[PDB]
Structures are given as C-alpha cells and as structure tokens.
Design a protein around this ligand. Structure first.
Ligand SMILES: O=C(O)[C@]1(F)CN(c2ncnc3[nH]c4cc(F)ccc4c23)CC12COC2
Length: 167
C-alpha cells in the first residue's frame, strides 16, 4: 500500500490522474518525482519550469553544479538529484524533443530509466512542450516501464482523451 490517491488503474503497474505534478508531489512527498528535463538541465518551462519554481530555484542551482561537473546528459538518459521540498529524489529524464528534431525512438530509452526505481510520480515524457503525441507517450510508458508509475496529467481535456483512447 502507498499514499497515492484518486488514480485510475491502467495496467498492473501504471496509474493515471488529472493533476498538477507540483501539487501532487507537495502532498505525497514521493520517494521519486520525475522531471521532464533537457540535456542541459535548464528548467525554463513546462513541467521542469514548474517543478523548479516550486523549489524556489534550488533545483536549478543544484542542476548547474551537476552540469559544471559532469557535462550534459544524453537524450534518453537521466540523473538522480535531490527532490528538494517536493520528494526525496528527483529523477531528471530527457525525452526526445520533437521541436528540436530528436528521434522519437529515444522515448523508449527515456522510459527505461524509470525501471531503476520501484515507485515514481511522473509526467508523460516528451509530452507538452516537447512536442510528442501524449497518446504515443502513454503507450510507450505502458510497454516499457515495469515498476509502479503514477502519471500526473495537468490538462483535463488531455487526461480524458488519454483514458478514453487507452487500449
Ligand atoms: O503543456 C505541457 O507541456 C504539459 F501539459 C505540462 N505537463 C505537466 N504535467 C504534469 N504536471 C504539470 N504541472 C505543470 C505545471 C506547469 F506550470 C506547467 C506544466 C505542468 C505539468 C505535461 C504536458 C507536457 O506533455 C503534456
């Protein structure tokens, strides 16, 4: 038993809710919250900008030190940093950004990072400002992640569509 509430069960291991991931993290304080990161960990907008804002920019400060030491992530890659006031840990995962011309096949590699964590609160990778089809992203999630994932979908209209079209 865990503390996630109000989710619809899609599969054995994948759950979904119409929720603001920031507000959900603040209430659950999960072990792992996933950020929709870019390779530079520049948390300007989308989910990343919202998570970083909720940390009062501490996420960005930590991220800048990480990049100064390690260089950029790979598209499809990840790193574990602090969850600050939102979670124990933040798993920064880089899905391909279609608005940058990145290969959508890298979306499966991005979701594979979730399998290193038993339970996660996460957004749909490559959705939103990353330009991928969220229905495709949900399908890849279900077909790739084997650990327990709680997906927060900000937009109510999209949430209803994802549920109603789910096979
Ligand atoms: O338009 C988009 O880019 C998205 F809708 C944003 N995403 C989110 N997903 C969960 N929680 C969220 N909280 C937020 C708070 C904000 F200020 C901004 C965004 C989100 C968000 C998912 C989305 C990207 O694929 C759909």
């Amino acid at each position: 038993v865990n503390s996630f509430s109000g989710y619809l069960k899609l599969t054995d291991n994948v759950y979904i809710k119409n929720a603001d991931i920031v507000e959900e993290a603040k209430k659950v304080k999960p072990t792992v919250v996933v950020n929709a990161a870019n390779v530079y960990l520049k948390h300007g907008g989308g989910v990343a900008g919202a998570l970083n804002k909720a940390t009062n920019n501490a996420m960005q400060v930590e991220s800048d030190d990480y990049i100064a030491t390690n260089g950029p992530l790979k598209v499809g890659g990840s790193c574990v940093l602090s969850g600050h006031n939102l979670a124990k840990h933040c798993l920064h995962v880089v899905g391909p950004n279609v608005n940058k011309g990145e290969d959508i096949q890298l979306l499966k590699s991005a979701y594979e990072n979730f399998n290193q964590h038993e339970v996660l609160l996460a957004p749909l990778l490559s959705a939103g400002i990353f330009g991928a089809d969220p229905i495709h992203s949900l399908r890849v999630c279900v077909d790739t992640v084997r650990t327990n994932v709680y997906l927060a979908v900000f937009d109510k209209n999209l949430y209803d569509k994802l549920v109603s079209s789910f096979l």
